[PDB]
Amino acid sequence: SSKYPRSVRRCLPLWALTLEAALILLFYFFTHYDQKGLVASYQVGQDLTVMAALGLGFLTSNFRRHSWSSVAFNLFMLALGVQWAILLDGFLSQKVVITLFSIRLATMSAMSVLISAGAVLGKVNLAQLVVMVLVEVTALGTLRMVISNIFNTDYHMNLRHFYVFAAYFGLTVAWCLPKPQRATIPSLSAMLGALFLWMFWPSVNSPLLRSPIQRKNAMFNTYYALAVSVVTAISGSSLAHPQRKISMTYVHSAVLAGGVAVGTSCHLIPSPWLAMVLGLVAGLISIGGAKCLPVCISVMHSIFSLLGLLGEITYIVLLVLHGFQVLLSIGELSLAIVIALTSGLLTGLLLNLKIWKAPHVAKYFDDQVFWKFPHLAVGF
Amino acid sequence: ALGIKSCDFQAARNNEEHHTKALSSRRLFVRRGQPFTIILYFRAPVRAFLPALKKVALTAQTGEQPSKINRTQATFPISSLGDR
Amino acid sequence: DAATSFLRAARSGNLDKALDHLRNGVDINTCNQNGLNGLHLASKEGHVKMVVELLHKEIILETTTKKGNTALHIAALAGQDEVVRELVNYGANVNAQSQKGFTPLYMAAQENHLEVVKFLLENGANQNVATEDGFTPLAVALQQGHENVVAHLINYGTKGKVRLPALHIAARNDDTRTAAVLLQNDPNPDVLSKTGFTPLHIAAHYENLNVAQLLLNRGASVNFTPQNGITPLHIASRRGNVIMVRLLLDRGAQIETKTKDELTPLHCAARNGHVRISEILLDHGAPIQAKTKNGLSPIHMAAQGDHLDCVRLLLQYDAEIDDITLDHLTPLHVAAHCGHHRVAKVLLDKGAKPNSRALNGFTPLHIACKKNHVRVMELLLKTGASIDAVTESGLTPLHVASFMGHLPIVKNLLQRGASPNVSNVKVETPLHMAARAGHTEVAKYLLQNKA
Amino acid sequence: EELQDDYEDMMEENLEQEEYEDPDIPESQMEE
């Protein structure tokens, strides 16, 4: 097989333009438009957009020669995912009325895919990412619809499982990919992205809560848990390292451990000390996973999945205080995990198709595959 | 449409090339690692060479209980991409 | 349409379809709209067998596409290490430049193909060749962040061609097809390696008769003499290649050629014990009394190596049995020095003088007693060697044996009646020699016998 | 490996150019 990348001058433009034309046609046929707090409602969605673009594009840009692709592909995936998620959430919760709240929900749905893509960035091209975006948005919408139909929950309120869904979907897709690093300036850019994610994660911890009191309590808990998690992660990076130094890449992923741990139950926490305890437990679990998971591909995605599972478990624990309820919650969690694994397997099987012109395994984590650089021999 | 009439092993030429000419000119004595030439005759003319080439495979067996794990049996196709 | 099918088969690796199309009459040098022929398409997809088959079909190796890229350029850009090796072995120019000045080394360096970079650098690729924009493989490797390529390019520098020429490799492996393709490309069969040897020298070394005959038919020099004077006939005689010796003599090899040490092929055959080669050379007119810079004749070489049958053959061809070197060493002296009692017996049975004198008056008996060679001593004493013979310094064999401490030789000499009362020019006795070297046992036996 | 014979140094070692030269005349004078 030729290690030189195949020409995508006819596959990628045709695919992207066809997707955009289909999106425009569907918006024309199925979408319709529509006060005092318009700016206040827009600010939450703006924070979600800022996270999804900046933090999730630069957080994976820590690679030595794959930061361009990480950032630009994250932007492209967000732009496609919001547009497709608007239509999918309109279809599965019913025409589609487009509001700021629907834009916020589609932004969360795209954030799920952006989190999943971190396990597969550096090993796929743009068309495979488009396929992953479409399939993952459809699978998350189907999971939310099934949960709403079975457990009598709300379709928009089933978006709380997006941490665990994104993590397991990303791991499952990365498992199916063919088997195959850092620099200072890309690490600083990833630190900027991680800082933005850490600062604005309280917004993503309460976009679905309606009452102001629950949102305020959730933001308090997320803020304190995130502070505790940052302290614990920066402290314990030296413990879980053979060189006895602090790993910047580990910090980039473990800054968010407390926010992930308290994400599903930030409104149920009645006092900030419990949130701080949860953040400390999240940080210690992150240290343990960083020290143990590589022994038994993406370590950060694996510890993110472990943190999401821990957050679900502590939600189960906290829900009892505030038999059949535990069974319903565990069944919902198991259904989410099974659907995420099945959809990840399907997406990985579709991503191995030869028609996508995937990069060679020896050309992984390189921007030279997808980007033009001067003084290069082109073609044969 | 691909019947086999006979198979000429060309014992004399191969034995002279494989330095076994003093053994016999009728039986085929060949040495390992060196090519030997045989001629395969068909009862009927072959219309298309490539499909018929894809339809034929050769098997060499030695011993009373040939097997692939014992390296006493080997099945190989007739093609130019084979491992010489 | 048939040419299109042939190109598609070349691209897809279907060698049978390509061979069928070539048999039907499809032009071998056909190409698509981009100028890529079957060789280019095969090199892009890593089909080594297709490349070999097309090269065997007299395809033009140095064909360039519309971008100026050869097959080697495409193979280096695609990262096909095996195809790059095969193309280089068949004579691809590693320093060829494209329209914009790109080289195969540049294409391998820009795509982080470290193995291809290593192979091209070992095969003579010049990293100092720049494109039309002034960029170098080192510069483009630095630009793209290929750290291993940069490190290897810096470390290698200008080490140059460390590999043999492709014709030498073909002659080593007796590859007649590769050699035929190389000679079709480069008509000269006498290409020189860094050591100075032609591929005919390699063919004679390994007795690769087929490639040697091919080179001799294409116009190779059968008597090509490098600075060291080692002809292919010399190598064939030294290596024991009888059939190669016969082939070289049939093609017109000179038999009296001397190396820088004045070694004839007869000397090389005799020092290694090749009786058949020596007989063939002597039947073709090899001088049997040729002497090297040290005065050694072929019989000296045969006696040095304990080559008994070679000594017999040389003596059968009227060799001087008492030929002397610059040190006046007869072949009997050489046999005594090396301890070859069989060679000494053969020489003595045919009339070699047992009491021949060297420069310092040493007899073969003296040298046999010096080197603790008891069997040679017994054979010489049987054949009339003087047990009381003296050197120019008056040294008896007992003197030398006592000084060297060889107790069994001293015991045998004293049992055969040698007198320990003999004296040197310094009047010293064998007891003096034993006492001056601390040989307690030899001195004790000398005291017990007659001292 | 199995390809060292394609290089100049290994081929030079294999050809054994020292075997085509007269090494020396062994005298080994007994005088101390």
Curated annotation (Swiss-Prot), chain A:
Q: What organism does the record attribute this protein to?
A: Homo sapiens
Which membrane topology term applies here? Multi-pass membrane protein
| Name listed for the protein in its UniProt record | Blood group Rh(CE) polypeptide
Gene3D superfamilies, sorted: Ammonium transporter AmtB like domains
Q: How does it assemble?
A: Heterotrimer; a RHCE monomer interacts with a RHAG homodimer. Component of the ankyrin-1 complex in the erythrocyte, composed of ANK1, RHCE, RHAG, SLC4A1, EPB42, GYPA, GYPB and AQP1. Interacts (via the N- and C-terminal) with ANK1 (via ANk 1-5 repeats); mediates the primary membrane attachment site for ANK1.
Disease per record is: Rh-null, amorph type: An autosomal recessive condition characterized by red blood cells that lack all Rh antigens, have increased osmotic fragility, diminished lifespan, and show changes in morphology resulting in stomatocytosis. Rh-null individuals have mild to moderate hemolytic anemia. They are at risk of having adverse reactions in response to transfusion or pregnancy, because they may produce antibodies against several of the Rh antigens.
Q: Where in the cell is it found?
A: Membrane
A GO cellular component term found in this entry reads: ankyrin-1 complex
The tissues in which it is expressed are:
Restricted to tissues or cell lines expressing erythroid characters. Isoform 4g and isoform RhPI-Alpha are expressed in immature erythroblasts but not in mature erythroblasts.
GO process terms (BP): ammonium homeostasis; ammonium transmembrane transport
Report which gene this protein is encoded by: RHCE
Q: What is the effect of changing residue 214 to E?
A: Found in antigen RhEFM
A Pfam family the protein falls into:
Ammonium_transp
Q: What domain of life? A: Eukaryota
Swiss-Prot record, chain B:
Protein localization: Cell membrane; Cytoplasm, Cytoskeleton
Which stretches of sequence are listed as region Band 3 binding?
28-36
Instruction: Fill in the PTM field for this protein.
Output: Both cAMP-dependent kinase (CAPK) and another kinase present in the red-blood cells seem to be able to phosphorylate EPB42.
Record's superkingdom?
Eukaryota
Mention any additional remark.
The substitution of an Ala for a Cys in the active site may be responsible for the lack of transglutaminase activity of band 4.2.
Assembly behavior: Component of the ankyrin-1 complex in the erythrocyte, composed of ANK1, RHCE, RHAG, SLC4A1, EPB42, GYPA, GYPB and AQP1. Interacts with SLC4A1 (via the cytoplasmic domain); this interaction is mediated by the SLC4A1 Band 3-I dimer. Interacts with ANK1 (via ANK 1-13 repeats). Interacts with AQP1 (via the C-terminal).
Q: Which family does it belong to?
A: Belongs to the transglutaminase superfamily. Transglutaminase family.
**Any idea what job this protein has?**
Component of the ankyrin-1 complex, a multiprotein complex involved in the stability and shape of the erythrocyte membrane.
User: Related disease?
Assistant: Spherocytosis 5: Spherocytosis is a hematologic disorder leading to chronic hemolytic anemia and characterized by numerous abnormally shaped erythrocytes which are generally spheroidal. Absence of band 4.2 associated with spur or target erythrocytes has also been reported.
Q: What is this protein's record name?
A: Protein 4.2
In terms of the whole protein, what range is present? Answer: 4 to 87 of 691
Curated annotation (Swiss-Prot), chain C:
In this UniProt entry, the residues modified to Phosphoserine are: 419
Q: Where in this protein does the record say (3S)-3-hydroxyasparagine is found?
A: 95, 223, 421
On tissue specificity, the annotation reads: Isoform Mu17, isoform Mu18, isoform Mu19 and isoform Mu20 are expressed in skeletal muscle. Isoform Br21 is expressed in brain.
- ANK repeat residues: 34-63, 67-96, 100-129, 133-162, 164-191, 195-224, 228-257, 261-290, 294-323, 327-356, 360-389, 393-422, 426-451
Post-translational modification summary for this protein: Regulated by phosphorylation. Palmitoylated.
Superkingdom? Eukaryota
What quaternary arrangement does the UniProt entry report? Component of the ankyrin-1 complex in the erythrocyte, composed of ANK1, RHCE, RHAG, SLC4A1, EPB42, GYPA, GYPB and AQP1. Interacts with a number of integral membrane proteins and cytoskeletal proteins. Interacts (via N-terminus) with SPTB/spectrin (beta chain). Also interacts with TTN/titin. Isoform Mu17 interacts with OBSCN isoform 3/obscurin. Interacts with HIF1AN. Interacts (via ANK 1-5 repeats) with RHCE; this interaction mediates the primary membrane attachment site for ANK1. Interacts (via ANK 1-2 repeats) with AQP1 (via the N-terminal). Interacts (via ANK 1-13 repeats) with EPB42.
- Name recorded for this polypeptide: Ankyrin-1
- Source organism of the structure: Homo sapiens
* Gene name of the record: ANK1
UniProtKB/Swiss-Prot annotation, chain D:
Q: Where in the cell is it found?
A: Cell membrane; Basolateral cell membrane
Region annotated Disordered sits at: 1-32
PTM statement from Swiss-Prot or TrEMBL: Phosphorylated on Tyr-7 and Tyr-20 most likely by SYK.
Regions of biased composition (Acidic residues) lie at 1-25
Tissue specificity, per the record, is: Detected in erythrocytes (at protein level).
- PTM annotation (Phosphotyrosine): residues: 7, 20
Q: Where is this region: (Microbial infection) Interaction with P.falciparum (isolate K1) FBPA?
A: 12-30
Q: Which family is this sequence assigned to?
A: Belongs to the anion exchanger (TC 2.A.31) family.
Q: How does it assemble?
A: A dimer in solution, but in its membrane environment, it exists primarily as a mixture of dimers and tetramers and spans the membrane asymmetrically. Component of the ankyrin-1 complex in the erythrocyte, composed of ANK1, RHCE, RHAG, SLC4A1, EPB42, GYPA, GYPB and AQP1. Interacts with STOM; this interaction positively regulates SLC4A1 activity. Interacts with GYPA; a GYPA monomer is bound at each end of the SLC4A1 dimer forming a heterotetramer. Three SLC4A1 dimers (Band 3-I, Band 3-II and Band 3-III) participates in the ankyrin-1 complex.
Disease field reads: Ovalocytosis, Southeast Asian: An autosomal dominant hematologic disorder characterized by ovalocytic erythrocytes that are rigid and exhibit reduced expression of many erythrocyte antigens. Clinical manifestations include mild hemolysis, intermittent jaundice and gallstones. However, the disorder is most often asymptomatic.
Q: What name has this protein been given in UniProt?
A: Band 3 anion transport protein
| Species the sequence originates in | Homo sapiens (Human)
- What gene name does this entry carry? SLC4A1
- Full protein: residues contained: 2 to 33 of 911
